[PDB]
Design a protein around this nucleic acid. Structure first.
Lengths: 50, 376, 48, 198, 124, 74
RNA sequence: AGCUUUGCGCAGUGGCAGUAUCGUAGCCAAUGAGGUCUAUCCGAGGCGCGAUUAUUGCUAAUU
């Protein structure tokens, strides 16, 4: 009740502290794994003869 | 032979000039007072250059007993107090004695642990008596230096009226004493002034960030320490720059009222408030409306390269094919269902294995490459 | 996660305010035991 | 050597201003010489005119920037926090003669970096050159340092080098006064050279 | 007018020549901007000459530079504008003190020597 | 070969002419003939000013070198 | 008379990368931006916001 009308008006607005990158990040592209992974996986199955 | 002989002359001169300082203090509350301040501020340099010599002598002498304490305790005064407290008897319950005031708890346990395996012989009685004599002389010199700093701090409203306004008389006294004079302070860049009084504190199993490095008296001043820790570096830099400006003004005895000092302090406060300013209102970005209209996209070299990168590769085209009725064997324990498909398996139709496409090779970002180049 | 991390922040703050919880005597005993064990095994420290 | 010895006499005579005039005339007659510049700088420093000595040293370093002796005295003419290491870094870029390495080793020994001081002393003696007060300073440091067997080893190496030829002895006379009559028979013969240096 | 504390003030022709040399030194990576960098160059003895502005307020924030120049035997001069001096240095922000460093084999050595001779005969 | 500042004759009569300049040097010229006799070489900074004593055998030359020098015949 | 250095334009040829390029009557900044290493040393933009197929145009298809 004792909050004056000036105090009521002087209430600040809430501003976000996160920057542009945090709030609205650019779309994160998804890419396939490099072919070296398949190459090394198929090389893993290879075994010596001695 | 020389340091001991010069110690008596240094003590006599310090006593005479301290009597002069006491007389000046009594008179204040043709021998002007500015010459007294100059003499005291040269006394500070003389006391520092005698105290470091005494510390080196003690370090050389005490190294026979506990050689490792020098690395654990880099500070000269702390080294002297520690070697005084421990003395010849390292394991004499001194750990829970006044050491807690001299040293931090972590470095106390570090020095106790190191003393557990000192591998250093005891010192002779003459070596002892010399060590306590040197420690007492160093403590007396430190007390005299404290008295001189107190006197100079009491008179900072005249010698450096502008610089007093920014960081206060105590920090002003410390920086003026460690710089060697107001004239020496002025003929010094702001970057060096910010590091005045900094100590290479040892980090005991901690990151260098925890033990604040490159921080001096200005970093621990009242105004700089009043900011949140994430802004204290910028605060220290700005306050050091403004203090350098004030010292340059003060060394020419201009703006004796403090108008330059008040303006610089107001600027510092405004910048601090700007750093503490709440973030502004930021609009929420709505989700883009779904669209079904045709969109024309250009081709060319860039499009060709993106098509080559994202495009399906023979190694991946072949790994997507799974034979019908050819029950393969599990090749990965940690993830079942995973298979190479037609890669290196019968029914693929290819005698030779597919080569690795170099266009799919892993590469790092341009900004990341710049950071790596900078790290080199 | 929020609750556990608040508790962890409180714990780290308490450790920084109350100092190390291992007294010098306990640290001396542990270090001496380790040193004696390593000397008994004639362990050669791993170089850089 | 005639110029600096006469200036030193004038300093001993008590008329230091005449010594200043003589050194100035010597520098005028022998431009860009570190030897005269070094004595001119030392004259003001020994007279308590540290500011004048520092100004003269700045002028000396403006000329002949590669002079090892000038830089060696320059770092020790600076206060220990006031760019005593920074000027070492500045001069190490300029040259690498033993006067540099001796000065760097002395600075490291001043900060009690005993390992680094010993390493730089070894570099000054073994690598840089085999003349000067390098062996005397190394012997003094090792006497101050904890090395005992190495203390005699440094003396043995100093005796192995610095022979009766007088090349190292004359350079040692710059700080050990080996050209004196008393030193004329302590470890060498005065009749051999000796008078060439000062 | 200008502060009398800046007695070695250059005229228009020398101001133009000094600004041109400062710009050329900036292009050759032979210039240091700011009073703190000028002090650092003076302390390290790698400064040919120091150019400082006469509009610095207060001027006492750079009046220590003439003393260091005298101690280190380095010519110094005062220019009438801190905005043109900053522009010559290649920085939009005003610069109240710039130092031209020493680079062996630099093609600006002759111009630097000529400017030093011109400055050293203008102070009085 | 640099900016000339101090010009002064012998105080008693026109015995000679003493000149000083920013060439960190001083020169002596016969007053009638205006020919050089002795170049007072020395100093390391610009010679700002000079004076000759009333006796005439004393010459003082202050300079930018922070030092002043005296000259008498020897 | 040639030769040659630096900066600025204007073009030509060629190479590289599209997790990046711009915009700043927004703010701060050589009167010091920003500092994990080298700190009585380093020395220039940083931040916030906005644009976007991580620069933008035409052209050709399907429509």
């Amino acid at each position: 009740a004792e909050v004056t009308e000036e105090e009521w008006l002087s209430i600040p607005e809430v501003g976000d502290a996160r920057n542009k990158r945090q709030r609205n990040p650019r779309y994160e592209k998804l890419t396939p794994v490099p072919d070296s992974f398949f190459a090394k996986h198929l090389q893993t199955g290879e075994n010596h003869t001695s | 032979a020389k340091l001991w002989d010069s110690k008596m002359f240094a003590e006599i001169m310090m006593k005479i000039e301290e009597y002069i300082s006491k007389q000046a203090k009594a008179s204040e509350v043709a021998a002007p007072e500015y010459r007294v301040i100059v003499d005291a501020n040269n006394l500070t340099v003389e006391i520092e250059n005698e105290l470091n010599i005494i510390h080196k002598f003690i370090r050389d002498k005490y190294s026979k007993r506990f050689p490792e304490l020098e690395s654990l305790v880099p500070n000269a005064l702390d080294y002297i107090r520690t070697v005084k407290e421990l003395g010849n008897s390292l394991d004499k319950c001194k750990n829970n004695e006044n050491l807690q005031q001299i040293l931090t708890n972590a470095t106390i346990m570090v020095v106790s642990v190191t003393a557990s395996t000192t591998q250093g012989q005891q010192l002779s009685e003459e070596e002892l008596e010399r060590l306590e004599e040197a420690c007492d002389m160093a403590l007396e010199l430190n007390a005299s230096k404290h008295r001189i700093y107190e006197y100079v701090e009491s008179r900072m409203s005249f010698i450096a009226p502008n610089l007093s306004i920014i960081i206060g008389a105590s920090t002003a006294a410390k920086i003026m004493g460690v710089a060697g004079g107001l004239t020496n302070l002025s003929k010094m860049p702001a970057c060096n002034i910010m590091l005045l009084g900094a100590q290479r504190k040892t980090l005991s199993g901690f990151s260098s960030t925890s033990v604040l490095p490159h921080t001096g008296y200005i970093y621990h001043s009242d105004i700089v320490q009043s900011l949140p820790p994430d802004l204290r570096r910028k605060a220290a830099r700005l306050v050091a720059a403004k203090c350098t400006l004030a010292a340059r003004v003060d060394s020419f005895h201009e703006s004796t009222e403090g108008k330059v000092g008040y303006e610089l302090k107001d600027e510092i406060e405004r910048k601090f408030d700007k750093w503490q300013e709440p973030p502004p209102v930021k609009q929420v970005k709505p989700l883009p409306a779904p669209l079904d209209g045709q969109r024309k996209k250009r081709g060319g070299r860039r499009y060709r390269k993106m098509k080559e990168r994202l495009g399906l590769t023979e190694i991946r085209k072949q790994a997507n094919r799974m034979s019908f009725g050819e029950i393969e064997e599990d090749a990965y324990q940690e993830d079942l269902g995973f298979s190479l498909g037609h890669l290196g398996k019968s029914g693929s139709g290819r005698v030779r294995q597919t080569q690795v496409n170099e266009a799919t090779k892993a590469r790092i970002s341009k900004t990341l490459q710049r950071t790596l180049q900078k790290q080199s | 996660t929020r609750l556990y991390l608040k508790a962890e922040q409180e714990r780290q703050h308490n450790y920084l305010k109350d100092g190390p919880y291992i007294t010098a005597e306990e640290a001396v005993a542990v270090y001496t035991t380790t040193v004696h064990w390593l000397e008994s095994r004639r362990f050669s420290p791993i170089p850089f | 050597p005639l110029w600096l010895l006469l200036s030193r006499l004038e300093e001993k005579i008590g008329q230091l201003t005449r010594a200043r005039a003589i050194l100035e005339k010597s520098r005028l007659k022998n431009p860009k010489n570190p030897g005269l510049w070094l004595e001119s700088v030392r004259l003001e420093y020994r007279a308590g005119l540290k500011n004048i000595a520092n100004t003269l040293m700045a002028k000396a370093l403006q000329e002949c920037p590669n002079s090892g002796i000038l830089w060696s005295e320059a770092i020790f003419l600076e206060a220990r926090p006031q760019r005593r290491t920074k000027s070492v870094d500045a001069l190490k870029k300029c040259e690498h003669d033993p006067h540099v390495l001796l000065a760097v080793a002395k600075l490291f020994w001043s900060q009690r970096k005993i390992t680094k001081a010993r390493e730089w002393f070894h570099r000054t003696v073994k690598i840089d050159s085999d003349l000067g007060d390098a062996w005397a300073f190394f012997y003094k440091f090792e006497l101050q340092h904890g090395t005992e067997e190495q203390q005699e080893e440094v003396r043995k190496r100093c005796e192995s080098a610095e022979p009766r030829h007088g090349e190292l002895w004359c350079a040692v006379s710059k700080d050990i006064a080996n050209w004196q009559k008393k030193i004329g028979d302590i470890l060498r013969l005065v009749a051999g050279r000796i008078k060439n240096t000062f | 007018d200008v502060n009398p504390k800046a007695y070695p003030l250059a005229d228009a022709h020398l101001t133009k020549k000094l600004l041109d040399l400062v710009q050329q030194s900036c292009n050759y990576k032979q210039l240091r901007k700011g009073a703190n960098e000028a002090t650092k160059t003076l302390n390290r003895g790698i400064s040919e000459f120091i150019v400082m502005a006469a509009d610095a307020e207060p001027l006492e924030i750079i009046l220590h530079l003439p003393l260091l120049c005298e101690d280190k035997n380095v010519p110094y001069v005062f220019v009438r504008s801190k905005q043109a001096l900053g522009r010559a240095c290649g920085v939009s922000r005003p610069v109240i003190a710039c130092s031209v460093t020493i680079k062996e084999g630099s093609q600006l050595k002759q111009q630097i020597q000529s400017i030093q001779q011109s400055i050293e005969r203008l102070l009085v | 070969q640099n900016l000339v500042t101090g010009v002064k004759f012998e105080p008693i009569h026109g015995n000679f002419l003493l000149t000083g300049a920013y060439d960190n040097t001083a020169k002596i010229w016969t007053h009638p003939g205006w020919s050089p006799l002795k170049t007072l070489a020395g100093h390391e900074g610009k010679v700002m000013g000079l004076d000759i004593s009333s006796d005439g055998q004393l010459i003082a030359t202050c300079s930018y070198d922070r030092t002043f020098k005296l000259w008498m015949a020897e």
